[PDB]
């Protein structure tokens, strides 16, 4: 049996994971108390991929909740599906990151990380055949950047052959919530290069654009943004949660989407997305799903795919549907837009299909895209980093908590080091 | 499988097409909520000409609503068939035309026409075999004169081999509803000549004279006037939606009624019209149906057909009728009125019958006429236009919005040039 341990870092990762566990509990039939009140046995068929068993026949998620401040744990616990986790897994510290990557990596995070790895070790030993770990975190800011990279490094050292799926919220160009977002993202992408197996970059400005231009809401909240994250977070892993013709788990997606070991940064996508007033007027079919996936507005990263050639594409569909139409639509997309796909990878689109659709829908289609267009994001963080780092402002906390200027220089040089191969694959 | 994309511009086009969608939903069996509650399978057999299918079996009209001022959008929604329309197909802006062709063609109409064309392409590529676009607008006034002609131009450039129909409410000879409607009508006819394939010149006073001399109403409504328009709108496109002998669609009418490419301005007519007293003094048959067809009081344009010889006449009948009476009656009309049909086109009358009569009526018939007598409308527009453009009145707000003297010069020269074929064909 295949199973995944779910790790949440920081307030952003904690809220994203709380919405994720709400979505997964609703999909698998678990009530907020924890008791299974379902409709089909396929929900219990593969429930030991995210939920540990118990006595009493009601199930407990395999989620470790890491934070450096003891308030977001209380918020997550006070949430609707909050009293479902293991209270032992609520690991927290009486300190504050202060949006300091130095304080998330070289100090109090480094003294909480022992207990974090202890509960991770217990959850991984209480298993049959581990597939890997999925971490939800924000790339910019403290905690989930510093804790995120520290846990990924320690877990990759301990378990060398298990998958690492990190959903990272990249800081946006238009808006920002942390001054040292360029510093934290620059310091964190270096560990995300040689550690994580699939990193999914999710941009808040792109979530803004999807929630306003496509979904057409009036007052969307972080609950809705994290729900847009969680739909893709479930659609990636639905193939080993439910049966289906032409299934593809995390490694069967990773081999087909990672051509070179560092080019594993993706633009996720979800595309049965419709405004509430126009939901009834839709004619939901496979070509319409393909149009909405490949359209350059449902990307959850702020990277327009027309600015770079696609390296690899993954399309994981859900719902009873014809495979001929899927091959129709992928062949038609590759033929009509041939300059936006690389020519040294013939048929650079991977297709998976699952049978059970999400509740309230008929067909779903989650989207994963490794394209050249991530160079815009990586360079953008690099010029913001050099703008704040040429005059060396907001740096004395890092140097006082124990960093050195060559560490920041190595981080920016390594994001340039990551920007270069994405360019040389997009330009042959 | 031939399908039609409907388009409606301005207040006049919006209300005419709203009544048209009410009438055609009555004909096809669609309720206001969009579900199908019909009587015979012949309604559902060809329902895919005006209605895109959707999930749940509700049918959504294939119409695009264009108006610069979102007031008639609210009126159409608050009307009876307002819930049937797609909420995404309402394209509107934050401006007002002000009955200015300059403000409807060289201004914010240009920043709204891109969204209109995106909606049009979304409704045109969700198809298998497109036949044509039809546009309802007012010839005199803003928006519908400006955005109507601009949208026709853009769609004709994008789709050059499809039928383009325009139901245009032309200005009156007696009473004006817009002071600058000679300017608007001239600038709109200049585009309509070398863009469209069929133009239906409809006059409000002519529809009204049908409403009282033939129907004997006492207090009509513009809803009744657009009902008279919509009857012809449905009667033209009825052989492509219902079976019969000698079926004729839009192009089969076009090839027969357009002898030369510029002379495609027609006079619509629909005449099984019995009044509240003379319905029960009536002996409803094909000969008197042809009599009310060819009487010069059931014209929907204020242009007397006795003033100019007919170039081409077509009639689309509906109902189970013997064709000997139809053929003999059209031959008898052509023979007994020799001075009104030119002799170099023998049998210049197209006959096409369908088998399913309009609900309530046993035998009905539409009438479309290309005549020499369309010259009076263009001549009245030309003479009012030169009386206004002479003194350069009501023009500073066209040049301020950014037009030139040469555009008015070219439009007037083009329409006075068009006056020459439609006098030479009358004079052989």
């Amino acid at each position: 049996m295949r199973e995944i341990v779910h790790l949440q870092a920081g307030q952003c990762g904690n809220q994203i994971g709380a919405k994720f566990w709400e979505v997964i509990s609703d999909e698998h039939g678990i009530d907020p108390t924890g008791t299974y009140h379902g409709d089909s046995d396929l929900q219990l068929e593969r429930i030991n991929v995210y939920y540990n068993e118990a006595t009493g026949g009601k199930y407990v998620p395999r989620a470790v909740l890491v934070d450096l401040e003891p308030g977001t744990m209380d918020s997550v616990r006070s949430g609707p599906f909050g009293q479902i986790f293991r209270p032992d897994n609520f690991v927290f510290g009486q300190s504050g990151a202060g949006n300091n990557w130095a304080k998330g990596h070289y100090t109090e995070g480094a003294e909480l990380v022992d207990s974090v790895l202890d509960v991770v070790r217990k959850e991984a030993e209480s298993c049959d055949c581990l597939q890997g770990f999925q971490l939800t975190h924000s790339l910019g800011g403290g905690t989930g950047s510093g804790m995120g990279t520290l846990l990924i490094s320690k877990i990759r050292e301990e378990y060398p052959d298990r998958i690492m799926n990190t959903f990272s919220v990249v800081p946006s160009p238009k808006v920002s919530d942390t001054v040292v977002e360029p510093y934290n993202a620059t310091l964190s992408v270096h560990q995300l290069v040689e550690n994580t197996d699939e990193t999914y970059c999710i941009d808040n400005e792109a979530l803004y654009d999807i929630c306003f231009r496509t979904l057409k809401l009036t007052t969307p909240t972080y609950g809705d943004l994290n729900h847009l994250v969680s739909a893709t977070m479930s659609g990636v892993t639905t193939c080993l949660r439910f049966p289906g013709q032409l299934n593809a788990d995390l490694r069967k997606l990773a081999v087909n989407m990672v051509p070179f070991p560092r080019l594993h940064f993706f633009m996720p996508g979800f595309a049965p997305l419709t405004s509430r007033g126009s939901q009834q007027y839709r004619a939901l079919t496979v070509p319409e799903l393909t149009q909405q996936m490949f359209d350059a507005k449902n990307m959850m990263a702020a990277c327009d795919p027309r600015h770079g050639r696609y390296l690899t594409v993954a399309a994981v569909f859900r719902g009873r549907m014809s495979m001929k139409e899927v091959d129709e639509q992928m062949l038609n997309v590759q033929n009509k837009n041939s300059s936006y796909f690389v020519e040294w990878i013939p048929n650079n689109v991977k297709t998976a299909v699952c049978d059970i659709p999400p509740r309230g829908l008929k067909m779903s289609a989650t989207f994963i895209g490794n394209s050249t267009a991530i160079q815009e994001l990586f360079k953008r963080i690099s010029e913001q980093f050099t703008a704040m780092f040429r005059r060396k402002a907001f740096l004395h906390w890092y140097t006082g908590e124990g960093m050195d200027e060559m560490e920041f220089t190595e981080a920016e040089s390594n994001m340039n080091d990551l920007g270069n191969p994405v360019v040389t694959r997009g330009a042959c | 499988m031939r399908e039609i994309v409907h388009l409606q511009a301005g207040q006049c086009g919006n209300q005419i097409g709203a009544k048209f969608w009410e009438v055609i939903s009555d004909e096809h069996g669609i309720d206001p909520t969009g579900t199908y509650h019909g009587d015979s399978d012949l309604q559902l057999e060809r329902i895919n000409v005006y209605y895109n299918e959707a999930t749940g079996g509700k049918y959504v009209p294939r119409a695009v609503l264009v108006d610069l001022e979102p007031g008639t959008m609210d009126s159409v929604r608050s009307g009876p068939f307002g819930q049937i329309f797609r909420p995404d197909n309402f394209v509107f802006g934050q401006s007002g035309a002000g009955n200015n062709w300059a403000k409807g063609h060289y201004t914010e109409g240009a920043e709204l026409v891109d969204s209109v064309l995106d909606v049009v392409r979304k409704e045109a590529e969700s198809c298998d075999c497109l036949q044509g676009f039809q546009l309802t607008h007012s010839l005199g006034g803003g928006t519908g004169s400006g955005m109507g002609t601009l949208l026709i131009s853009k769609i004709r450039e994008e789709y050059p081999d499809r039928i383009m129909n325009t139901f245009s409410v032309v200005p009156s000879p007696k009473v004006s509803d817009t002071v600058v409607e000679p300017y608007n009508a001239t600038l709109s006819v200049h585009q309509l000549v070398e863009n469209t394939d069929e133009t239906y010149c409809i006059d409000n006073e002519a529809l009204y004279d049908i409403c009282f001399r033939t129907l004997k109403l006492t207090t009509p409504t513009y809803g009744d006037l657009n009902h008279l328009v919509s009857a012809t709108m449905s009667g033209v496109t009825t052989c492509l939606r219902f079976p019969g002998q000698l079926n004729a669609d839009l192009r089969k009418l076009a090839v027969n009624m357009v002898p030369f490419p510029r002379l495609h301005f027609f006079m619509p007519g629909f005449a099984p019209l019995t009044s509240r007293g003379s319905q029960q003094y009536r002996a409803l048959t094909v000969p008197e149906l042809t009599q009310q067809m060819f009487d010069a009081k059931n014209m929907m344009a204020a242009c007397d057909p006795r003033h100019g010889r007919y170039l081409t006449v077509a009639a689309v009948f509906r109902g189970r009728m013997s064709m000997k009476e139809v053929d003999e009656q059209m031959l008898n009309v052509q023979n007994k009125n020799s001075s009104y049909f030119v002799e170099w086109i023998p049998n210049n009358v197209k006959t096409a019958v369908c088998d399913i009569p309009p609900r309530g009526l046993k035998m009905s018939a539409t009438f479309i006429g290309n005549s020499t007598a369309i010259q009076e409308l263009f001549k009245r527009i030309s003479e009012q236009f030169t009386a206004m453009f002479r003194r350069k009145a009501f023009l500073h707000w066209y040049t301020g919005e950014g037009m030139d003297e040469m555009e008015f010069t070219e439009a007037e020269s083009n329409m006075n040039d068009l006056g020459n074929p439609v006098v030479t064909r009358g004079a052989c």
């Binding site: 795919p305 770079g308 009509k336 837009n337 041939s338 936006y340 270069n420 | 995106d118």
Partner: peptide, 28 residues
């Protein structure tokens, strides 16, 4: 001419714009 993955791309003889060039094999 079609820009990208829009509706204008998948329509009969629709020529598509190429993606912009990138900094590889290019002077800095």
């Amino acid at each position: 001419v079609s820009e990208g993955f829009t509706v204008k791309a998948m329509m009969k003889n629709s020529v598509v714009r190429g993606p912009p060039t990138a900094g590889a094999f290019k002077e800095r």
